[PDB]
Subunit: 305 residues, 4 copies
């Protein structure tokens, strides 16, 4: 099996290196427009291979030829209307370039705004809906779990969480569907502290930008690599991702963050969890925000932007 | 760090090999009364070490000298009144033999009946209550999770469960504290099927005996090795184990299956989860059964048995 | 990918569990004639899967239906003329039963006498020579490396060794092709001690039988599982195995222990290392012994045995 | 156990993340002068911890307080006379700052020029010679092995190599002490191709700089993390590192690249491999170059630089 990562910056390179370390794929190919960068990073990773002990071949290139016949593609290239326009162009374009040579692939998008970029890639791909998804929920939940584990001083291995919706303010937290060793977290942490943690999770990306002046990559890269492993292994992970919904949660014709079953078939099922009145209202708001962005897309298209 | 496993039969040898494969401990020592068995198994494991790639030294012996200054001890030696008498003698005796040379150790008991044998070891040890525990819940939950994952066709990595109480009929299942990707399992599986799975979990040990004519070891060994890793790593796992309860769940002066935080301090906390009326009634019944066994212990002591 | 293990005794079950723990194959199937044993062991392994964290499905059966469309098969069923006759019957028979349903598989034999049983399986298989091999060298080298690492008090990770030929007296040790952190072992250990270690390696199987009264399984199982991983991953391991030689080392028409490149194509290359006069003489003797066994095969066939 | 990494740039952060992923240390602390960078990177790594599944706590700070009572320290801070002066100041200074709070630590230096910086740190540390070493050989050998594995199309797991001396032109390659599955590489690759690979290894750092415009970090970080693991695990790895030599190879009073045994005692032994006339001449030249740098140090000290 063969994996392509589009974009060889911090996030893309992290995806590539994490997939290569798993030693499941035969090859991982980084493609990027910047001459020499994917080549240098790939060479550095290959030189690390005997030390870590993986045989996955890592390649870097500026052309799409070497990405041909890929099984999985992770799209990380990407920098309100200006951004939507700029990233739409980047994501749509690289998707077109990629799918010509890999018609049987499954695509994982990591570009903002994430739910809308997932749709942009789906449309440019010509693939069925199950073959395109976005990484967000796994990062958001990894963050939430890390904060919970820190608060309780418990192993991260025993904290599980479900989060839905979009990123940031439109992210939909589900503390009652967050557990520690099977125990719902509201039994262990009080409401005010849970709400503090929810707010930190919503702003987590910006928090890191504020500290170091650029956005995260270790956790975003790990999250996309986990989704890649599930596809390659066909192991049926249940993870929250940006996925096409047809009727679930009463949403339709929409890519948004939902729990899914992931395997060789891409998004094999969208799981429907019970949401109470307030949670439905939050999800409705988040869906409204995705539709707003979709509307802006067409307006910007109309205007030649 | 150094680990002793008392008993070099199928379960003990599995504990030893699993701990050695983790490559955390410097040494693992199997001690057993049968001349040549722990020696042969340890030699076979050492000869496997370059193939698997672990440096943990595995030793086998018939004497307690080589177990001295151990950090963790897992007691697996062990074959109603006849059994209680026989295993009490074995477990109490090996505990006495062991603790003389390892006064600073933490003990994990794997002998039936499990809750009572955990007490027998505690009493023979002279250790504080936090330093002695029994393996049961991790095996029971591993079983329950495996059945759930099989039923839903989902990754075992995404199924979590909490079970309390004793083994078998007195095991206390908590399906509402069982989740798949964060989603409570009763939302996904209907009541009749959940009850089928609960009953299979209760009888799981006997099921294997009925198939192959002797009791399990891969899963019991893995479970005790997981508990050992938590102590060695001080990683604060939240796991159900037979632990001393002082007031939790309204139980007192009692070792029974409860969720605990495990680390270098042994049982560092007993976590109290919310139990509804029926669950409390089930736990009360299970506690009653442990007390019955404790009563039988003293009767058999009185009678010279 | 799918792996079958024929024989669910100590060695076969170890192969199965080790392959399942690697979490590379989708399924591992143990087949054995003894009702209930493979079923019980497979169930125990499945119940361990959430504790260890693997999604490979382990199945046990008494029939060959469930082994169909396997990619790799490891044959471990098997108990001088009496043994050769008995194991020839077992190995030839199970091979016939297996290949009917898995015509595209690669076979790894673990039955004694190993070089001759590898040929017996090849003949019963109808497969090309590259698709059938025997496990011996990886076990012998794992043993030799473990003894060297113990003698020097160095990591097993840094000791490498090459051994050729058959098992036991006809095993061909190559101390000058044995290194520690790249340093040939004769520079570190003196001749008399190297010869002690060579003799221990030759008798290692019997040593364990003498200690515990039955033969090893942890290291033999690990060795066959390593060979299985190489095929599944197509990672091009260079390992000593019983392989068909056409001209290499001047041997012809012969399965015997040689360094090979292993990948998806089975034995992809037989590597020819330089042997000095004494080493050639030893290999010639070992080949003579394999031919003797091959001769006995046909004599026993002639005699209706 | 606790690990400090001085410098939170690409290399230091890679060391930290690699050590944290091993899940052996309780805590890893990155310290760096740049406000916010180690904090941001550490937060990103902590948020990745539930996804990868490690409990090692990663901390970032601009002060040395949080590094106190560290067991291992990896020094990666650091940018001919100008460089020697600049890095001497950085390395000596951070060493002084660090050892005040961690008097029982072992130090691994990753700053250029590597052999001389290892001495600078040793002198600033007040530690015995066994407690200070430099990372170079493991990176150089990882590179050489990767090139060999690529050339032969074999697993990196089966290629081992020994390299001594300094970095670059003064690096001392030992192709006859380089093996593939135990087979010396000159038996498989011809002289001209081996020399090509040796020259590529010598210039490997510059090759990457030439491709991407900045120096490597995946492989350098992996190499220092491997050395850290050996100390933490006390596993007795035999690896080439910059270590203090007292009489070995006829060198004296000198830190230079040699094969060593690494464990809890730091550099526990310097192993002496047999060198032929040409190899001795190469090592003598490399030692001459280290002494030249040592001489320059004192000249620059004399001159107030």
């Amino acid at each position: 099996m063969k994996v392509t990562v589009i974009g060889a910056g911090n996030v893309g390179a992290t995806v590539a290196e994490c997939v290569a370390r798993q030693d499941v794929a035969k090859e991982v190919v980084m493609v990027d427009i910047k001459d020499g960068m994917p080549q240098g990073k790939a060479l550095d990773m290959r030189e690390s291979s005997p030390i870590h002990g993986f045989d996955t071949r890592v390649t870097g290139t500026n052309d799409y030829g070497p990405t041909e016949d890929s099984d999985v593609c992770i799209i990380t290239a990407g920098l309100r209307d200006d951004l939507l326009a700029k990233n739409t162009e980047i994501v749509g374009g690289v998707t077109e370039q990629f799918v010509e040579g890999s018609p049987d692939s499954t695509i994982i998008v990591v570009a903002n705004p994430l739910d809308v970029m997932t749709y942009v890639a789906y449309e440019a791909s010509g693939f069925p809906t199950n073959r395109v998804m976005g990484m967000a929920g796994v990062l958001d939940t990894g963050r939430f779990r890390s904060f919970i584990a820190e608060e309780l001083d418990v192993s991260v291995r025993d904290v599980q969480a479900l989060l839905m919706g979009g990123h940031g303010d439109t992210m939909v937290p589900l503390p009652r569907y967050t557990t520690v060793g099977g125990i719902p977290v509201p039994q262990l942490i009080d409401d005010a502290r849970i709400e503090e943690i929810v707010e930190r999770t919503k702003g987590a990306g910006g928090e890191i930008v504020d500290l170091m002046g650029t956005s995260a990559w270790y956790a975003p890269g790990a999250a996309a690599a986990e989704m890649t492993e599930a596809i390659l292994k066909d192991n049926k992970r249940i993870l929250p991702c940006a996925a096409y919904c047809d009727g679930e949660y009463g949403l339709d014709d929409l890519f948004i963050g939902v729990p899914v079953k992931l395997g060789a078939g891409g998004v094999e099922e969208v799981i429907e969890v019970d949401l109470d009145a307030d949670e439905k209202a939050q999800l409705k708001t988040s869906a409204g925000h995705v539709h707003s962005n979709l509307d802006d897309l067409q307006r910007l298209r109309d205007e030649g932007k």
